[PDB]
Structure prediction request, 317 residues.
Amino acid sequence: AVVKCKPTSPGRRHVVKVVNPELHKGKPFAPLLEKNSKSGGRNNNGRITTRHIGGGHKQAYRIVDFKRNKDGIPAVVERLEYDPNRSANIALVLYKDGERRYILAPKGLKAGDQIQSGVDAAIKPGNTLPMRNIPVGSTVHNVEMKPGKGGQLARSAGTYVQIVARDGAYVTLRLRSGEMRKVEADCRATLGEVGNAEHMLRVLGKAGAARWRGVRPTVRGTAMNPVDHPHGGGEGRNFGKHPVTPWGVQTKGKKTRSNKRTDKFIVRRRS
Amino acid sequence: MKRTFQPSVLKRNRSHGFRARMATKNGRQVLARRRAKGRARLTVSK
RNA sequence: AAUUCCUUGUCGGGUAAGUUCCGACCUGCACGAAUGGCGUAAUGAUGGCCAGGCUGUCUCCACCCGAGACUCAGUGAAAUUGAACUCGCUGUGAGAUGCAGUGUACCCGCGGCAAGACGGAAAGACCCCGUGAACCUUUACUAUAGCUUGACACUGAACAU
RNA sequence: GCUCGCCGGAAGACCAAGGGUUCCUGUCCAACGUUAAUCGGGGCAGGGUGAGUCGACCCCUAAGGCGAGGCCGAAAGGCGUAGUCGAUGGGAAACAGGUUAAUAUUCCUGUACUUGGUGUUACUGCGAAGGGGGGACGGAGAAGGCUAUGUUGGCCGGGCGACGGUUGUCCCGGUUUAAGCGUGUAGGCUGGUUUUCCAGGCAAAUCCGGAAAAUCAAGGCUGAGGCGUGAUGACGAGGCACUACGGUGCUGAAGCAACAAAUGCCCUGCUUCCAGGAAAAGCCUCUAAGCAUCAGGUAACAUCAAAUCGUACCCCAAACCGACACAGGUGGUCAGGUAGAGAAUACCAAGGCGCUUGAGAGAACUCGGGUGAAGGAACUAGGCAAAAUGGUGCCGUAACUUCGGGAGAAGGCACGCUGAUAUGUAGGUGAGGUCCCUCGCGGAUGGAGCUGAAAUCAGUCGAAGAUACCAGCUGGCUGCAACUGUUUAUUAAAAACACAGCACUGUGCAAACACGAAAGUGGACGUAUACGGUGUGACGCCUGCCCGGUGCCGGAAGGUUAAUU
RNA sequence: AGGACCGAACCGACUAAUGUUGAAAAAUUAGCGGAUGACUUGUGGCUGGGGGUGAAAGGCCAAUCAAACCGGGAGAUAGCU
Prediction:
């Protein structure tokens, strides 16, 4: 639920919380946890490769099952859990054979709801089937780009793709970006939308909240000196040049997709 | 005032010790130059 | 106006008196709407202004308590230094302890002051010069990483037009 | 040695780091010590550091490092797998007392404990580089139950006062005792037990997980402290003999209770919140391959072993970092009394110091402070500095406002001591006794004793009662930035930088982008409600006109146009 | 509950005076700010010079920074003193 805190202090005026009492108020499933050490945006050479990353709260990685390859075995949802490694919530599901796994929580999946994977699974939210058996025009998430490797599209809080066509061994998809991409008609997809839609309405309200997420402050570039950034300096606020990345790239319309390897699955790139 | 030298024998030996010098091509050249010069203390080991 | 050169703009407010401050006028030298415009409670070791209280901030300093300064004993530096038997004045040579003229002045210390010795300190940062540098900028020149275009190569097979 | 003064949340005590004999004794005073020096962290010599339980080593891993092969790279070399290193973390066990000039949880006394090896006996399904469990973990907050510790009383011993009084409701001192073993409490968590079955845990599994039944509710785990034992002991204020007045043998009384009480323990708990909170081993179990009148495993007893290195001393400092015996810097632990909200502050205890030049004088001037007639910002760039305000409780409190604030707005009244209410109240604590009982560290009742506010009334002293230290000046107008924050270490703390928020734009994942000749890595074990870049900078009302120029995104008829031919 | 309030430790460094061959190659004294957090701190680790890091000052990178230090090219060159 969305709730606006009261202005009892500067820093709580504009904070907007996304509270969900259905989430588990306890510890997560240990067998599906792993160490996840922070990097600070630094690579094996110790150099900052991605700026504005550092600090934040300690996080343990939940082993989420993006493949959903346990076919023909029903699973019941035990509880919805909070996952710090992603925007969406996860669901601890219990299979009939006694195996437990984590999955992305769809829109209206609750505790006790049954799910199933495979070609003979029912068309209901949470079930994962190859897009060959998914009716055209339906909404899915956690879509595979290559059969058997795992879902890669529509995994965020409230994301979803729409199957708009199915020509042959391929199917066409409307990605949340507006891109019209086509993938093989054997890649698995999960029915429904990822349910944390209110995640977008969240308002951090203060700088420290971003530091909790591991986001370090962003220095503009006009505030720097020319030795540090093209936008550089000047006596006062001058900025008399075309907007440009560090390292000299436009950043205001210049397309930088230079793959040319797929060049086939794209139809309606976007906009 | 906090000065520059804050001693730590562990960091001393790991940074300038014998095995740290013998672990790289250039560190081994340091010892060669100090041996040729005739240094009595090749390193900061002990 | 953090923006107004003319300029202390004009009027009003506040003061006995207000180049600042506040409120209006607009004649905006040269505001202006995300290099954001106008407002804005709260916040600020933030800038400016006005009051009460408070006072040695001041009128105008006085006294007192301590640490130094002063004297004795012990220890014992420093910058500086061409050499010195190292006065004033006027003039001279371009602002004189040292030249000319003249005046004054017994020899040597101690405590104080800091006008001068163009005092000490750092081969002036201003200025100019050097066919000196260094970083920075760009539609200065020449290049270049990168990005990108095509040809050939890795690279073949048939079919149809 | 007698006084005085200073620190006492340290200027005391114990450590790490670091240093490395500065430790103790004797001896010496040239140099070193900012003076003298018989003294010294100085010189010379000698002596001193004793561990199965402390720590390291060791077992285990984090970040990260190295890295067989391997991938990559002109060479050097780079990345990285299996692995192997790497604490700042996890992992078995010792306490008290006594003792040296200098060491001790290390020596001695007493009492203990842990992990292994071997052997004997008895009962036996043992076995992993594998599986599972466990280890294993956040912030804040809330009390409750305890202890350390303290206060008082009682008890024991001593004392009867340099000057009035002091045989009493007087004064001084002491009233200490551990680990371990046993008990398993306050309180916390969890429903247990048996059988059957199973797509899971890379194969298996009696283990974990899952499913369906039956049977009982009392089962278990964890757990401070207390009590008992340890302890007919040790310690013990003080005595009796030796007593070089440097100390040694023996003896050595009381050794209880109540109250208060932690930031420490129960608590790795409980509650709650979002930012969602290490790993591995030891340890407990499961079996596989394999081994079974073996080997191994379990328990008991006996016996052996537990090596090696460190241990002195300083450690907020004269011994470390600062060239100095330098107003500096330096992480952790212990945390007494009175007042106090308090680790502030003042004065004290334990304990430790008076800071390595002194003496005298009592000018100017400087420094650091105190007071000040009348005036009260007239000073000055500027109320710079100084002065002033200062506490608790009650009353009371404006514009404006994002309705939270503003606000401790402003401003006003009362604060001491004594007595009474009440021989010490409300409250808290809680004994004996009584009753119950699944007969226990139980419950109920009971209220002794102890402790103890706050308020009212009356009276009383002083110029002054938040009397000292401690301890907001306040209000009004306005610019800038929303705010908390960040910044030129060493002349600039700001209106600058961040900021939440907003927008544009890029990016479909082998993402864009970045570090890299490359491999690869980060981005991200993320997937457009995501990520990167740019600008703006809470919020509120808004964000207008111009695409000629430059750039960017698109497009095509044609022109022009490289290598090549 | 709080990048909440007052205020020690702790972390900072707004004002003034002193000091300026200082006690100190940036401190002392009196006040000052933050003080559950974008906090602070110990230990160890990573990032290496046209590079790092930077809530951005051209700041910091061993008292040195508009391109560290050491060595070398090197007796650079100096129409200037």
About this structure: The two ends of chain B are 29 Å apart (CA to CA). Chain B has one domain: 1-46. Residues 1-46 of chain B form a domain with the Helix Hairpins fold (CATH 1.10.287.3980). Helices of chain B lie at 9-16, 18-21, 25-37.
